[PDB]
Each structure stands twice: as structure tokens, then as C-alpha cells.
């Protein structure tokens, strides 16, 4: 992906505890991932 080419890439502003990274990704819901930050079950882009 370091040299992969894309179209229409946008950044996101969200602050998480850090212990629920797997929870932010779809398939898991938590105290902050359940409500505050949600990702679709088919979500492009990675977690940084």
C-alpha cells in the first residue's frame, strides 16, 4: 500500500481509549465503539 494508488481519501477526527482497537473495527461494539465511533461491516481504509 506504500505505493498503491487511490482516489477520494479523507481523514477522520476521533480519539479512543486505545484498548478497544478491535472494537472500533466492525464486528464488535463497546462503551465508546458501540456509540461514538462506528465502522461499516465493509469499510475501506486501515486503522492508524
Amino acid at each position, epitope marked *: 500500500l506504500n505505493d498503491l494508488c487511490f482516489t477520494n481519501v479523507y481523514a477522520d477526527s476521533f480519539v479512543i481509549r486505545g*484498548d478497544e482497537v478491535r472494537q472500533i473495527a466492525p464486528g464488535q*461494539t463497546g*462503551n465508546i465503539a458501540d456509540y461514538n465511533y462506528k465502522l461499516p461491516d465493509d469499510f475501506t481504509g486501515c486503522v492508524i
Partner: nanobody
């Protein structure tokens, strides 16, 4: 609208074990957090523990007086939450109540307090 039934309390010796059950009927506790409270006569109701709808250790909360001794678990199929006391102390002798609301996740400071059961008496003595 939900009613709760506490049971399992009784006369136990110091250092003993017990298992309380907070039976929920007419409503489902699966999407809602559940909290445990105890109140011996003389003192105001105090929190014991609070389990969330996900039943996760992160969402699993215990009060200081019960850390490392009291454990809870829930089975939403039967619509009841357990509370397992280990090494019961005489200070734990109180009327244990379970409280729940429409909220789903507990916090270190927020426990459901909407609907309460009749309560069960846990006595830790000879």
C-alpha cells in the same frame, strides 16, 4: 415495568460462599445493564457491582469492598444475573438488592437505579 427477584441469601459463616440470583420477568435484561446493591439497616444503599449488556470485563464493575471476592455473571436466555460471593465477611451482612434500567453499559460511577427487586438478606455470622 420490569420486576426483579433476589434470592439465595441466608445464614452463612464468615469466609463462606454464596450465589445470589436476580430473576427478571416480563422484560428482557439482555440489552440493559444490571447493578447489584446491598443495604444493611442503618446505612444508606451502597453499590456492590454493575454488569453491562455486553458482560465484558471492561464493562464489569465491582465496588472496593467487593473487589477480588464478589463475582457476577449473566445468562440472558433465562433473564437473570448471578452474584457470587467468595470468602464472605461479617461486613457483607446486608440486604442485597439488584437494580436495572434501560441503560446498557455500566460505569465506575453510574449504576442503574430505575427498577429494584424486593431484595435478599445475606447474613455472615455463626
Amino acid at each position: 415495568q420490569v420486576q426483579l427477584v433476589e434470592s439465595g441469601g441466608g445464614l452463612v459463616q464468615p469466609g463462606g460462599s454464596l450465589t445470589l440470583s436476580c430473576v427478571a420477568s416480563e422484560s428482557s435484561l439482555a440489552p440493559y445493564r444490571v447493578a447489584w446493591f446491598r443495604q444493611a439497616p442503618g446505612k444508606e444503599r451502597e453499590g456492590v457491582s454493575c454488569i453491562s449488556r455486553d458482560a465484558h470485563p471492561t464493562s464489569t464493575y465491582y465496588t472496593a469492598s467487593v473487589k477480588g471476592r464478589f463475582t457476577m455473571s449473566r445468562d440472558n436466555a433465562k433473564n437473570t444475573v448471578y452474584l457470587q460471593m467468595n470468602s464472605l465477611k461479617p461486613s457483607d451482612t446486608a440486604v442485597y438488592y439488584c437494580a436495572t434500567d434501560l441503560g446498557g453499559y455500566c460505569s465506575d460511577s453510574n449504576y442503574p437505579r430505575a427498577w429494584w427487586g424486593q431484595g435478599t438478606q445475606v447474613t455472615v455470622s455463626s
